[PDB]
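Supplementary material to the annual report.
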Amino acid sequence: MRKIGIIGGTFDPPHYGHLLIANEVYHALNLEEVWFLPNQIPPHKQGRNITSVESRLQMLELATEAEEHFSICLEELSRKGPSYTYDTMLQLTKKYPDVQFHFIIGGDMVEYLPKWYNIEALLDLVTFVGVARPGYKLRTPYPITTVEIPEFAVSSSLLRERYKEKKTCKYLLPEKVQVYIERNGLYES
Amino acid sequence: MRKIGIIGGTFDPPHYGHLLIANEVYHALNLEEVWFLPNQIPPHNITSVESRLQMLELATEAEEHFSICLEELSRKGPSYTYDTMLQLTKKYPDVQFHFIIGGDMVEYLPKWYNIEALLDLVTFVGVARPGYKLRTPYPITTVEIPEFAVSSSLLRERYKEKKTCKYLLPEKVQVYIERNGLYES
Ligand SMILES: O=C(CCC(=O)Nc1ccccc1Cl)/N=N/C=c1ccc(=C/N=N/C(=O)CCC(=O)Nc2ccccc2Cl)cc1
Ligand SMILES: [K+]
Ligand SMILES: [K+]
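Predicted assembly:
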């Protein structure tokens, strides 16, 4: 069975923090590849902006393009609305019978796993890989894998605000992403 | 209509980080009260419900505007937040519930069970560090919270290593933990 990691999120925008996490799990668990799984976003409720599927996808391409062992999985992005991880992984299991999935989650996510839709059935579809700060451990009734990664603290929520202020995010995300964002005036709001 | 906060988790153990967040939301939104909502942990080493409730009681005994809400512990498996809020809105029709979530949770809200229906039962409050702007298509309130990097994960390992956690959670909770050997492993 091919060992394939999954890292999901809206990647809005993708940055070095995402890359570092995917990379650390790739090396730590000796995966064949890591697939980035861009989430769908429902239309805004009160006339504000959501970054387009096309824009988020293009940034993700630019962010990952150079690393042979990263790819983009379009399973959720191709759907009209958001997906429960269970439904997504059921589909990927159908599409790729020879693949073993390692689904990467943040350390803070671990204690809330029991509230995920169809969690018991999901555990039969994937192996969770929780990210912990060096030296420390995640606690869950569930059989999960733990990978230690330093907390690098880069966040999409901080980057967007910089762009809104017409600052650069050079050195916080791949140069190609920076060039694409400032050009298209993303995150100006 | 009363404004009441909810902060949910396994509180395993509760710590200054939890109290700080509950307090900041309490002050920022001028809430009447904040209820700590202990989660059920399903069987599949798990900290007993009794020990977690005891810690939560010890953590909140000093603070006037912090209460414990047992709604989730009163059911057997796990509860979706939707299930819980359906019951609390029924029990307290006169309450406007503000459900507090970590900043990092906000981008994944669309994946929460029955999110649209839940949006009619709660006002989400996302907490974030200075300079973070949370982004969601859903109508949520934001609260800036100071950074104190304490986590239950960090505390459990210190206790395993027999290190003190003085200054990281209430003295009474530490003593309960140490006496009971909760995280010795
Ligand atoms: O695909 C995924 C995640 C992928 C991912 O994990 N990528 C990833 C990969 C690598 C690194 C990082 C990341 Cl994020 N989607 N998961 C969907 C969820 C469904 C249900 C959930 C239930 N939450 N219930 C609550 O009551 C939470 C309360 C709370 O938030 N308390 C709170 C209060 C104050 C402060 C802090 C906190 Cl926590 C949570 C998530
Ligand atoms: K690539
Ligand atoms: K429950």
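DSSP finds six helices and six strands in chain A.
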